[PDB]
Amino acid sequence: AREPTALATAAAIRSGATTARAETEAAIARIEALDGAINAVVVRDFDRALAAADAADARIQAGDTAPLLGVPMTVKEAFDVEGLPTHNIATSDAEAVRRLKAAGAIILGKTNVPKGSSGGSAAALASGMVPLELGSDIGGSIRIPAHFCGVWGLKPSWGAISSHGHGAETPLGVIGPMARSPDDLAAMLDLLATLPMPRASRPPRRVLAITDHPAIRTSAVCRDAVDTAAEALAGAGIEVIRSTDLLPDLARQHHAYGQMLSVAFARSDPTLHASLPNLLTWLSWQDAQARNTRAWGRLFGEVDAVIAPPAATQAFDAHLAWAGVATYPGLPAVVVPVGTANGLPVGVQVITDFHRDHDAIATAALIHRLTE
Amino acid sequence: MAREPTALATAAAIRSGATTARAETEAAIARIEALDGAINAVVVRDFDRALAAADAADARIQAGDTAPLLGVPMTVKEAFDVEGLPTHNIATSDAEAVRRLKAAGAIILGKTNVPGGSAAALASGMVPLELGSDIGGSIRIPAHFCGVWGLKPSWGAISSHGHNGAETPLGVIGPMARSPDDLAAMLDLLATLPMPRASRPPRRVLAITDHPAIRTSAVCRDAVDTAAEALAGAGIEVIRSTDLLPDLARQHHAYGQMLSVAFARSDPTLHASLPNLLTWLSWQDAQARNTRAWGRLFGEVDAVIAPPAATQAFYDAHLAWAGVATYPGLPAVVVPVGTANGLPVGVQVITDFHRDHDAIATAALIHRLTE
């Protein structure tokens, strides 16, 4: 019995089948079993978590309908949690953490940063330690650990979710959920989003499948996974196309991702301050980025999603190539497991139009049902 | 954790028709393919022949076979030869301990690391049964670290042919699993000759926490003291000292010297620090005298509980706790007794030569009384 999802854990508690306190203790036991083996949870907060569970149950006794109430979960080390270090002890929750606690979740600890498989959120999830986790993703840190480990991840539309606590919003970067079921991604998006994202739905009718990218070779296995998902959609009465004149040049887009990424990964490297553009150049880049986003809007007038590889390889600045297709335009992107090959999980990334996040989740759910 | 079923319970399930060997192996495979992109233990897969083994195993079930681990999926260290798989060198016949596991009905899916591991494969729940080796802790110390059980048998109890010609002094091969019952069934399948059954609960136990050669983490000591309390509270005399305890400092030295020989036989550079033959024989005679000193201690106490290592999880003095048993050839079981600081914490139980089952038994007692 693969472990219950976050909403099913929520349902279980609400329905009296279990208590928040039995759920957190069980999580802790699961962490204490594997942790000498995966070593994911680098920061523990079990004692306050156990009291959180007790607060959470009292709320259940007096009719609180918070949707994730009593569900144990974890977060990247890069998010501030009041009381825990962020290595530097933090005196208030990050915004996405304040929302998860408000919604009733219980933060057991924080996981690594993915210093290729992870030992992080993704590990914590595939291992079944907790059903819910929260990462970040500027160059794949959500979508590519999830590929590697066989879990789901949402990289939202840019600016959908405050990353205060993780301060202007940082261009390209986002924060997003990771979990083992599409339903959880949706519930979590719906908790985290600054404003309500479109339902926007209906099933897709035409999908675009890419397998190659001018900037890296892409492992046969990574291509195969797309081609599998393409066949499953084709065979369910959905038009699948391999190419369109509306697809923005991906080679140029990569370059632009490069340039922009530098700025960020260089603001904090004093020596390389003198390779920064002037201000007018910089603003030329944002105007360029917006032009790209509107080109992707033109593509999404023809197709309802785009399915691609999340990365070049399986597990074990051109491994960034497949992350940038969406991170640069700010498009929403979901990674969904579609099989195993050579002993190792194999996923696909689904991409939809700006602010069509739920549809991404929905279309990834469709792909997963039709292949598993 | 819907903790995973034991090997004997998987065996019962199949025997009773509640499941098939083939559903059990498929499930294992799925569980490996889930975690493997995360823990990365199973470096050698043989899934397609495993799936046919499962079908051979079911046919035997349809003709009334009561072989004790029939259809149970398991894994083995990479260092054991399995016919068809490499051992890095493709191997043309099973190691002896593998021939026995197949005869007894088990299905070898693949092979794990040398330090994840067997221990990871187990703690992760991928398979209920695994087979390691241990000259300086490779069984008992991964098991400590991960919260699984491990048996380092009495030396010579089990052929390690296939793991170089003669059995290697000090080294053993042993099983790893998640329950004492499994260890016993496996010992009893693997042992060249039948080992004495466990014929009574312990009445006096010796609890050691410190060792002249290393500092031992408070946590590692605490776990012993926990195990001591559980036994004390069940009417069992627990003592912290006896004059019959063989000098552990000298024993360490002897372990040092002997270990070198082995871990140096095939390392040209160290060849000139090898003893002469008469020296070597002085050492074996010394080792046999130690084994009989441990026998004198085991006339007074029925077991010895110690730390399996100095620390929890995540340099030849981390071997100090392994040597207490490996040197005299004593049997040794490591059993999980709780957690501290987010990580599993175990204890090693040691009994007299060929009192392996008692070791398992006394470790079962300690585990029941603390969980």
Short mmCIF file of all heavy atoms in Angstrom, two decimals, chain A residues 1-3 26 29-39 44 46 117 119 123 126-128 145 148-150 315-316 340-345, chain B residues 1-4 29-30 32-40 45 47 116 119-120 123-125 142 145-147 313-314 338-344:
data_model
loop_
_atom_site.label_atom_id
_atom_site.label_comp_id
_atom_site.label_asym_id
_atom_site.label_seq_id
_atom_site.Cartn_x
_atom_site.Cartn_y
_atom_site.Cartn_z
N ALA A 1 0.86 -1.20 0.00
CA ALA A 1 0.00 0.00 0.00
C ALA A 1 0.89 1.24 0.00
O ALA A 1 1.05 1.88 1.04
CB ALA A 1 -0.96 -0.03 1.18
N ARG A 2 1.45 1.59 -1.18
CA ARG A 2 1.97 2.93 -1.47
C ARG A 2 1.26 3.90 -0.51
O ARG A 2 0.14 3.64 -0.08
CB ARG A 2 1.86 3.29 -2.96
CG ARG A 2 3.07 3.14 -3.90
CD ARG A 2 2.95 3.95 -5.23
NE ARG A 2 4.17 4.35 -5.96
CZ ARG A 2 4.43 4.31 -7.29
NH1 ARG A 2 3.55 3.77 -8.13
NH2 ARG A 2 5.56 4.77 -7.81
N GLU A 3 1.96 4.96 -0.11
CA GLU A 3 1.54 5.81 0.98
C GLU A 3 0.42 6.75 0.55
O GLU A 3 0.43 7.25 -0.58
CB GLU A 3 2.74 6.64 1.44
CG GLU A 3 3.71 5.88 2.33
CD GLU A 3 3.15 5.90 3.74
OE1 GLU A 3 2.10 5.28 4.03
OE2 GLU A 3 3.79 6.57 4.55
N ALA A 26 3.83 9.01 12.66
CA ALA A 26 4.13 8.07 11.57
C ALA A 26 5.15 8.66 10.60
O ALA A 26 6.13 7.99 10.29
CB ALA A 26 2.88 7.65 10.86
N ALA A 29 8.59 8.53 12.36
CA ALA A 29 9.04 7.15 12.28
C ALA A 29 9.58 6.82 10.87
O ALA A 29 10.71 6.32 10.77
CB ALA A 29 7.92 6.23 12.70
N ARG A 30 8.85 7.17 9.80
CA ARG A 30 9.33 6.96 8.44
C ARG A 30 10.63 7.72 8.14
O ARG A 30 11.47 7.25 7.38
CB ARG A 30 8.34 7.36 7.33
CG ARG A 30 7.15 6.42 7.30
CD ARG A 30 6.06 6.74 6.31
NE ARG A 30 5.65 8.16 6.35
CZ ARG A 30 4.48 8.65 6.78
NH1 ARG A 30 3.65 7.98 7.53
NH2 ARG A 30 4.19 9.88 6.50
N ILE A 31 10.79 8.93 8.67
CA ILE A 31 12.02 9.68 8.45
C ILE A 31 13.12 8.97 9.23
O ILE A 31 14.18 8.69 8.67
CB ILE A 31 11.86 11.18 8.80
CG1 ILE A 31 10.78 11.90 7.97
CG2 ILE A 31 13.15 11.96 8.67
CD1 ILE A 31 10.49 13.31 8.48
N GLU A 32 12.85 8.60 10.50
CA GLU A 32 13.88 8.00 11.34
C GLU A 32 14.34 6.64 10.83
O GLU A 32 15.40 6.18 11.23
CB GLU A 32 13.41 7.92 12.78
CG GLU A 32 13.35 9.32 13.37
CD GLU A 32 12.98 9.41 14.83
OE1 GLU A 32 12.04 8.68 15.22
OE2 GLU A 32 13.61 10.23 15.52
N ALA A 33 13.54 6.01 9.95
CA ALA A 33 13.90 4.74 9.36
C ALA A 33 14.90 4.94 8.23
O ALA A 33 16.03 4.44 8.28
CB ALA A 33 12.66 4.04 8.89
N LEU A 34 14.50 5.72 7.22
CA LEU A 34 15.28 5.92 6.01
C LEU A 34 16.43 6.92 6.18
O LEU A 34 17.35 6.89 5.37
CB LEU A 34 14.33 6.42 4.92
CG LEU A 34 13.55 5.33 4.20
CD1 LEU A 34 12.15 5.83 3.88
CD2 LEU A 34 14.35 4.92 2.96
N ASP A 35 16.35 7.83 7.16
CA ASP A 35 17.21 9.01 7.14
C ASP A 35 18.68 8.57 7.18
O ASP A 35 19.52 9.26 6.63
CB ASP A 35 16.84 10.03 8.20
CG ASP A 35 17.26 11.48 7.94
OD1 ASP A 35 17.00 11.99 6.82
OD2 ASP A 35 17.79 12.12 8.87
N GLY A 36 19.00 7.41 7.77
CA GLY A 36 20.35 6.86 7.74
C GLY A 36 20.66 6.11 6.44
O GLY A 36 21.27 5.05 6.47
N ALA A 37 20.28 6.69 5.30
CA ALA A 37 20.19 5.95 4.05
C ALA A 37 19.93 6.89 2.87
O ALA A 37 20.56 6.74 1.84
CB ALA A 37 19.10 4.90 4.15
N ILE A 38 18.98 7.84 3.05
CA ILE A 38 18.68 8.91 2.10
C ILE A 38 19.29 10.25 2.54
O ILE A 38 19.65 11.07 1.70
CB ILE A 38 17.16 9.08 1.95
CG1 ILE A 38 16.56 8.14 0.91
CG2 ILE A 38 16.79 10.53 1.63
CD1 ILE A 38 15.06 8.35 0.72
N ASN A 39 19.28 10.51 3.86
CA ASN A 39 19.81 11.71 4.49
C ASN A 39 19.25 13.01 3.90
O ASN A 39 20.02 13.92 3.58
CB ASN A 39 21.33 11.72 4.43
CG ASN A 39 21.87 12.72 5.41
OD1 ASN A 39 21.34 12.86 6.51
ND2 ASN A 39 22.89 13.48 5.03
N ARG A 44 15.45 19.21 11.72
CA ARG A 44 14.27 18.62 12.30
C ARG A 44 13.66 19.61 13.31
O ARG A 44 14.34 20.45 13.86
CB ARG A 44 14.62 17.24 12.84
CG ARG A 44 15.08 16.27 11.75
CD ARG A 44 16.20 15.35 12.16
NE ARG A 44 17.48 15.90 11.71
CZ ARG A 44 18.57 16.07 12.46
NH1 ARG A 44 18.54 15.69 13.74
NH2 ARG A 44 19.65 16.62 11.91
N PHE A 46 10.74 18.25 15.24
CA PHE A 46 9.79 17.21 15.58
C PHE A 46 9.00 17.58 16.82
O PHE A 46 7.83 17.25 16.88
CB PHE A 46 10.51 15.89 15.83
CG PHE A 46 11.17 15.29 14.59
CD1 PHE A 46 12.02 14.20 14.70
CD2 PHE A 46 10.87 15.77 13.31
CE1 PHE A 46 12.61 13.65 13.56
CE2 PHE A 46 11.40 15.17 12.18
CZ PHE A 46 12.28 14.13 12.30
N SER A 117 20.43 12.87 -8.62
CA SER A 117 19.13 12.36 -8.18
C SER A 117 18.45 13.29 -7.17
O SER A 117 17.23 13.47 -7.26
CB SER A 117 19.25 11.02 -7.60
OG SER A 117 17.95 10.49 -7.41
N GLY A 119 18.54 13.72 -3.06
CA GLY A 119 18.64 13.66 -1.61
C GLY A 119 17.96 14.89 -0.99
O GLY A 119 18.53 15.55 -0.10
N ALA A 123 13.58 13.12 -3.18
CA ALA A 123 13.87 11.90 -2.43
C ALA A 123 12.83 11.66 -1.33
O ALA A 123 12.22 10.58 -1.26
CB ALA A 123 15.27 11.95 -1.85
N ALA A 126 9.71 10.36 -3.05
CA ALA A 126 9.67 9.06 -3.70
C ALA A 126 9.78 7.97 -2.64
O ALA A 126 9.15 6.91 -2.74
CB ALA A 126 10.76 8.96 -4.68
N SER A 127 10.52 8.32 -1.58
CA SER A 127 10.74 7.44 -0.45
C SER A 127 9.48 7.31 0.39
O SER A 127 9.49 6.50 1.29
CB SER A 127 11.85 7.96 0.44
OG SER A 127 11.34 8.92 1.37
N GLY A 128 8.49 8.18 0.20
CA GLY A 128 7.23 8.06 0.92
C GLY A 128 7.26 8.68 2.32
O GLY A 128 6.35 8.42 3.12
N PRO A 145 14.73 17.05 -10.40
CA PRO A 145 14.63 16.04 -9.33
C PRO A 145 13.37 15.17 -9.40
O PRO A 145 13.41 13.99 -9.05
CB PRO A 145 14.71 16.92 -8.08
CG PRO A 145 15.61 18.06 -8.52
CD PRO A 145 14.98 18.41 -9.86
N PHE A 148 13.77 12.62 -12.15
CA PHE A 148 14.76 11.66 -11.70
C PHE A 148 14.14 10.68 -10.72
O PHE A 148 14.50 9.50 -10.79
CB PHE A 148 15.97 12.34 -11.03
CG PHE A 148 17.03 13.05 -11.89
CD1 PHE A 148 18.03 13.82 -11.31
CD2 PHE A 148 17.04 12.94 -13.28
CE1 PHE A 148 18.98 14.46 -12.08
CE2 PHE A 148 18.01 13.57 -14.06
CZ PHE A 148 18.99 14.32 -13.46
N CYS A 149 13.22 11.13 -9.84
CA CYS A 149 12.77 10.31 -8.71
C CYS A 149 11.37 9.72 -8.86
O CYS A 149 10.95 8.92 -8.03
CB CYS A 149 12.72 11.10 -7.41
SG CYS A 149 14.37 11.61 -6.87
N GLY A 150 10.64 10.17 -9.89
CA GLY A 150 9.32 9.65 -10.21
C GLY A 150 8.21 10.30 -9.41
O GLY A 150 7.16 9.71 -9.23
N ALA A 315 18.69 9.76 -14.01
CA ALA A 315 19.60 9.98 -12.89
C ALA A 315 20.83 9.06 -12.98
O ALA A 315 20.75 7.92 -13.45
CB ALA A 315 18.83 9.75 -11.62
N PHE A 316 21.99 9.59 -12.57
CA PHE A 316 23.24 8.86 -12.52
C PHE A 316 23.62 8.35 -13.91
O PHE A 316 23.65 9.19 -14.83
CB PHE A 316 23.12 7.70 -11.53
CG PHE A 316 22.63 8.07 -10.13
CD1 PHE A 316 21.48 7.49 -9.60
CD2 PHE A 316 23.36 8.96 -9.33
CE1 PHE A 316 21.04 7.82 -8.33
CE2 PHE A 316 22.91 9.29 -8.05
CZ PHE A 316 21.76 8.71 -7.55
N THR A 340 9.40 3.66 -16.52
CA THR A 340 10.74 3.42 -16.02
C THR A 340 11.50 2.78 -17.17
O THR A 340 10.87 2.11 -17.97
CB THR A 340 10.66 2.53 -14.78
OG1 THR A 340 10.39 1.20 -15.24
CG2 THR A 340 9.59 2.98 -13.80
N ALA A 341 12.80 3.07 -17.28
CA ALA A 341 13.66 2.47 -18.29
C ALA A 341 15.08 2.44 -17.77
O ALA A 341 15.58 3.45 -17.32
CB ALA A 341 13.60 3.24 -19.55
N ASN A 342 15.67 1.23 -17.77
CA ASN A 342 16.99 0.98 -17.23
C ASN A 342 17.00 1.10 -15.71
O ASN A 342 18.02 1.44 -15.12
CB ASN A 342 18.05 1.90 -17.83
CG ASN A 342 18.17 1.74 -19.31
OD1 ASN A 342 18.33 0.62 -19.82
ND2 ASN A 342 18.13 2.86 -20.02
N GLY A 343 15.86 0.80 -15.08
CA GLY A 343 15.79 0.62 -13.64
C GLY A 343 15.38 1.91 -12.93
O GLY A 343 15.17 1.91 -11.71
N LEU A 344 15.25 2.98 -13.74
CA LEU A 344 15.22 4.35 -13.24
C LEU A 344 13.98 5.07 -13.75
O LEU A 344 13.64 4.92 -14.93
CB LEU A 344 16.50 5.04 -13.68
CG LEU A 344 17.77 4.72 -12.87
CD1 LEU A 344 18.93 5.55 -13.45
CD2 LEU A 344 17.64 4.98 -11.37
N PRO A 345 13.34 5.91 -12.90
CA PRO A 345 12.12 6.65 -13.30
C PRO A 345 12.34 7.48 -14.56
O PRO A 345 13.46 7.96 -14.80
CB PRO A 345 11.81 7.58 -12.08
CG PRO A 345 12.61 7.03 -10.92
CD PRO A 345 13.80 6.28 -11.55
N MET B 1 4.73 4.34 7.90
CA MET B 1 5.18 3.24 6.99
C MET B 1 4.28 2.02 7.19
O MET B 1 4.29 1.42 8.26
CB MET B 1 6.63 2.81 7.26
CG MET B 1 7.64 3.19 6.19
SD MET B 1 9.32 3.28 6.86
CE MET B 1 10.10 4.29 5.59
N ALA B 2 3.49 1.67 6.16
CA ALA B 2 2.87 0.36 6.12
C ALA B 2 3.99 -0.69 6.03
O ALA B 2 4.14 -1.33 4.99
CB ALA B 2 1.89 0.27 4.96
N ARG B 3 4.77 -0.85 7.12
CA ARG B 3 6.06 -1.53 7.09
C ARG B 3 5.87 -2.76 6.20
O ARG B 3 4.76 -3.27 6.09
CB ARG B 3 6.56 -1.84 8.51
CG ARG B 3 6.96 -0.63 9.35
CD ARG B 3 6.65 -0.65 10.89
NE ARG B 3 6.41 0.68 11.51
CZ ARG B 3 6.87 1.18 12.69
NH1 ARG B 3 7.67 0.46 13.45
NH2 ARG B 3 6.51 2.39 13.10
N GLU B 4 6.93 -3.17 5.49
CA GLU B 4 6.79 -4.20 4.46
C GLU B 4 6.77 -5.59 5.11
O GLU B 4 7.38 -5.83 6.16
CB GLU B 4 7.85 -3.96 3.39
CG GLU B 4 7.48 -2.83 2.44
CD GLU B 4 6.55 -3.34 1.35
OE1 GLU B 4 5.38 -3.58 1.68
OE2 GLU B 4 7.02 -3.63 0.21
N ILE B 29 10.16 -5.49 -7.82
CA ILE B 29 10.75 -4.79 -8.95
C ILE B 29 10.22 -3.35 -9.02
O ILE B 29 10.97 -2.39 -9.18
CB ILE B 29 10.44 -5.56 -10.25
CG1 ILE B 29 11.23 -6.88 -10.29
CG2 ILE B 29 10.71 -4.69 -11.50
CD1 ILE B 29 10.64 -7.88 -11.27
N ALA B 30 8.90 -3.22 -8.95
CA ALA B 30 8.25 -1.93 -8.86
C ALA B 30 8.85 -1.12 -7.70
O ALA B 30 9.25 0.01 -7.92
CB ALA B 30 6.76 -2.16 -8.75
N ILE B 32 11.80 -1.42 -6.32
CA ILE B 32 13.18 -1.05 -6.61
C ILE B 32 13.12 0.13 -7.59
O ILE B 32 13.75 1.16 -7.37
CB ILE B 32 14.01 -2.25 -7.12
CG1 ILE B 32 14.11 -3.36 -6.09
CG2 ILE B 32 15.40 -1.83 -7.55
CD1 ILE B 32 14.85 -4.60 -6.58
N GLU B 33 12.29 0.02 -8.64
CA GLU B 33 12.28 1.04 -9.67
C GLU B 33 11.71 2.36 -9.15
O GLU B 33 11.89 3.39 -9.79
CB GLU B 33 11.53 0.49 -10.88
CG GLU B 33 12.32 -0.63 -11.55
CD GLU B 33 11.73 -1.17 -12.83
OE1 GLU B 33 10.50 -1.37 -12.84
OE2 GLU B 33 12.47 -1.33 -13.83
N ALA B 34 11.03 2.33 -8.00
CA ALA B 34 10.51 3.54 -7.36
C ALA B 34 11.62 4.29 -6.64
O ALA B 34 11.93 5.44 -6.97
CB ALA B 34 9.41 3.18 -6.40
N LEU B 35 12.27 3.62 -5.69
CA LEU B 35 13.27 4.24 -4.84
C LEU B 35 14.63 4.35 -5.50
O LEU B 35 15.43 5.19 -5.09
CB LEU B 35 13.36 3.43 -3.55
CG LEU B 35 12.24 3.72 -2.55
CD1 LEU B 35 11.76 2.43 -1.87
CD2 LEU B 35 12.75 4.80 -1.57
N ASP B 36 14.92 3.51 -6.50
CA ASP B 36 16.29 3.38 -6.99
C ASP B 36 16.79 4.73 -7.50
O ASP B 36 17.99 5.01 -7.40
CB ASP B 36 16.46 2.24 -7.99
CG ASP B 36 17.85 1.63 -8.08
OD1 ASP B 36 18.43 1.32 -7.00
OD2 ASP B 36 18.32 1.43 -9.23
N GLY B 37 15.88 5.58 -8.01
CA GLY B 37 16.22 6.93 -8.43
C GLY B 37 16.27 7.90 -7.25
O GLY B 37 15.78 9.01 -7.34
N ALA B 38 16.92 7.50 -6.15
CA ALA B 38 16.79 8.17 -4.88
C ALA B 38 17.82 7.62 -3.90
O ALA B 38 18.53 8.42 -3.28
CB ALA B 38 15.39 8.00 -4.34
N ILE B 39 17.85 6.28 -3.74
CA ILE B 39 18.77 5.58 -2.85
C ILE B 39 19.90 4.88 -3.60
O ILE B 39 20.99 4.72 -3.04
CB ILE B 39 18.00 4.61 -1.93
CG1 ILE B 39 17.69 5.32 -0.56
CG2 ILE B 39 18.75 3.29 -1.75
CD1 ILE B 39 17.95 4.54 0.74
N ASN B 40 19.64 4.39 -4.81
CA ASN B 40 20.65 3.85 -5.73
C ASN B 40 21.49 2.72 -5.12
O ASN B 40 22.71 2.74 -5.18
CB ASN B 40 21.59 4.94 -6.25
CG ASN B 40 22.32 4.44 -7.47
OD1 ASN B 40 21.73 3.72 -8.29
ND2 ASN B 40 23.59 4.78 -7.59
N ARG B 45 20.89 -5.63 -12.06
CA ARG B 45 19.54 -6.12 -12.13
C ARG B 45 19.53 -7.37 -13.00
O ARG B 45 20.37 -7.54 -13.89
CB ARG B 45 18.62 -4.99 -12.59
CG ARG B 45 18.65 -3.73 -11.75
CD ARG B 45 18.56 -2.50 -12.64
NE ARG B 45 18.96 -1.30 -11.89
CZ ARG B 45 19.80 -0.35 -12.33
NH1 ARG B 45 20.51 -0.57 -13.43
NH2 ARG B 45 19.87 0.82 -11.68
N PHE B 47 16.13 -8.78 -13.57
CA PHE B 47 14.70 -8.75 -13.38
C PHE B 47 14.02 -9.75 -14.30
O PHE B 47 13.04 -10.36 -13.90
CB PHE B 47 14.18 -7.34 -13.65
CG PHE B 47 14.58 -6.31 -12.59
CD1 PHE B 47 14.32 -4.95 -12.79
CD2 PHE B 47 15.18 -6.70 -11.38
CE1 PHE B 47 14.66 -4.01 -11.81
CE2 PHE B 47 15.55 -5.74 -10.44
CZ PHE B 47 15.28 -4.40 -10.65
N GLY B 116 24.60 3.44 -0.54
CA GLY B 116 23.60 2.55 0.08
C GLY B 116 24.22 1.20 0.45
O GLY B 116 25.37 1.15 0.90
N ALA B 119 21.82 -2.83 3.51
CA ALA B 119 21.09 -2.21 4.59
C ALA B 119 20.08 -1.20 4.08
O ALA B 119 18.95 -1.16 4.54
CB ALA B 119 22.04 -1.54 5.55
N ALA B 120 20.50 -0.36 3.14
CA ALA B 120 19.57 0.56 2.47
C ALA B 120 18.42 -0.17 1.77
O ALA B 120 17.24 0.15 2.00
CB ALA B 120 20.32 1.40 1.47
N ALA B 123 16.09 -1.16 4.56
CA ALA B 123 15.41 -0.14 5.35
C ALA B 123 14.40 0.55 4.46
O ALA B 123 13.36 1.00 4.90
CB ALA B 123 16.40 0.82 5.93
N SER B 124 14.72 0.60 3.18
CA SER B 124 13.84 1.19 2.18
C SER B 124 12.64 0.29 1.92
O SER B 124 11.70 0.70 1.27
CB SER B 124 14.58 1.44 0.89
OG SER B 124 14.63 0.25 0.10
N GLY B 125 12.69 -0.97 2.33
CA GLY B 125 11.56 -1.87 2.14
C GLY B 125 11.53 -2.53 0.76
O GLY B 125 10.53 -3.13 0.40
N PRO B 142 26.38 -1.15 8.84
CA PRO B 142 25.25 -0.68 8.02
C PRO B 142 23.87 -0.95 8.64
O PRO B 142 22.92 -0.15 8.46
CB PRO B 142 25.50 -1.47 6.73
CG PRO B 142 26.99 -1.57 6.67
CD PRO B 142 27.32 -2.00 8.08
N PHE B 145 23.25 1.53 11.43
CA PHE B 145 23.04 2.81 10.78
C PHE B 145 21.62 2.93 10.24
O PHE B 145 21.03 4.00 10.38
CB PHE B 145 24.03 3.07 9.65
CG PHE B 145 25.47 3.47 10.00
CD1 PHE B 145 26.44 3.54 9.00
CD2 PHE B 145 25.87 3.79 11.30
CE1 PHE B 145 27.75 3.92 9.29
CE2 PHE B 145 27.18 4.16 11.58
CZ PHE B 145 28.12 4.23 10.57
N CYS B 146 21.06 1.85 9.67
CA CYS B 146 19.80 1.93 8.92
C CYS B 146 18.58 1.37 9.64
O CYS B 146 17.46 1.53 9.16
CB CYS B 146 19.89 1.15 7.62
SG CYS B 146 21.04 1.92 6.45
N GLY B 147 18.78 0.69 10.77
CA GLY B 147 17.69 0.17 11.59
C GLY B 147 17.20 -1.21 11.12
O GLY B 147 16.06 -1.59 11.36
N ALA B 313 25.01 7.42 11.93
CA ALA B 313 25.19 7.51 10.48
C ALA B 313 25.48 8.89 9.90
O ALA B 313 26.19 9.73 10.46
CB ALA B 313 23.93 6.93 9.90
N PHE B 314 25.02 9.08 8.65
CA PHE B 314 25.43 10.16 7.76
C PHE B 314 24.59 10.15 6.44
O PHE B 314 23.55 9.43 6.26
CB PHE B 314 26.94 10.03 7.47
CG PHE B 314 27.43 8.66 7.00
CD1 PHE B 314 26.99 8.11 5.79
CD2 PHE B 314 28.38 7.94 7.73
CE1 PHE B 314 27.45 6.87 5.36
CE2 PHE B 314 28.83 6.70 7.29
CZ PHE B 314 28.37 6.17 6.10
N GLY B 338 16.05 1.83 18.95
CA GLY B 338 15.38 3.12 19.01
C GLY B 338 16.00 4.09 18.02
O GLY B 338 16.66 3.67 17.08
N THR B 339 15.76 5.37 18.24
CA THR B 339 16.31 6.37 17.36
C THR B 339 16.76 7.51 18.25
O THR B 339 16.21 7.64 19.32
CB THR B 339 15.24 6.77 16.33
OG1 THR B 339 14.31 7.68 16.91
CG2 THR B 339 14.51 5.56 15.76
N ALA B 340 17.82 8.22 17.85
CA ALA B 340 18.21 9.46 18.50
C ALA B 340 18.78 10.41 17.44
O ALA B 340 19.68 10.01 16.69
CB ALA B 340 19.22 9.18 19.58
N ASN B 341 18.25 11.64 17.43
CA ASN B 341 18.77 12.70 16.58
C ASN B 341 18.39 12.45 15.12
O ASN B 341 19.08 12.92 14.23
CB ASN B 341 20.28 12.88 16.71
CG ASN B 341 20.68 13.26 18.12
OD1 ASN B 341 20.14 14.21 18.70
ND2 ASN B 341 21.62 12.52 18.68
N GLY B 342 17.29 11.73 14.89
CA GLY B 342 16.69 11.63 13.57
C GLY B 342 17.13 10.36 12.87
O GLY B 342 16.60 10.09 11.77
N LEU B 343 18.01 9.59 13.54
CA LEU B 343 18.72 8.46 12.94
C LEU B 343 18.59 7.20 13.80
O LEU B 343 18.70 7.26 15.02
CB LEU B 343 20.19 8.85 12.78
CG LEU B 343 20.54 9.79 11.62
CD1 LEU B 343 22.04 10.09 11.58
CD2 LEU B 343 20.12 9.23 10.26
N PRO B 344 18.47 6.00 13.18
CA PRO B 344 18.44 4.72 13.89
C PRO B 344 19.61 4.50 14.84
O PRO B 344 20.70 4.99 14.59
CB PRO B 344 18.46 3.64 12.77
CG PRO B 344 18.07 4.37 11.53
CD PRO B 344 18.46 5.82 11.72
#
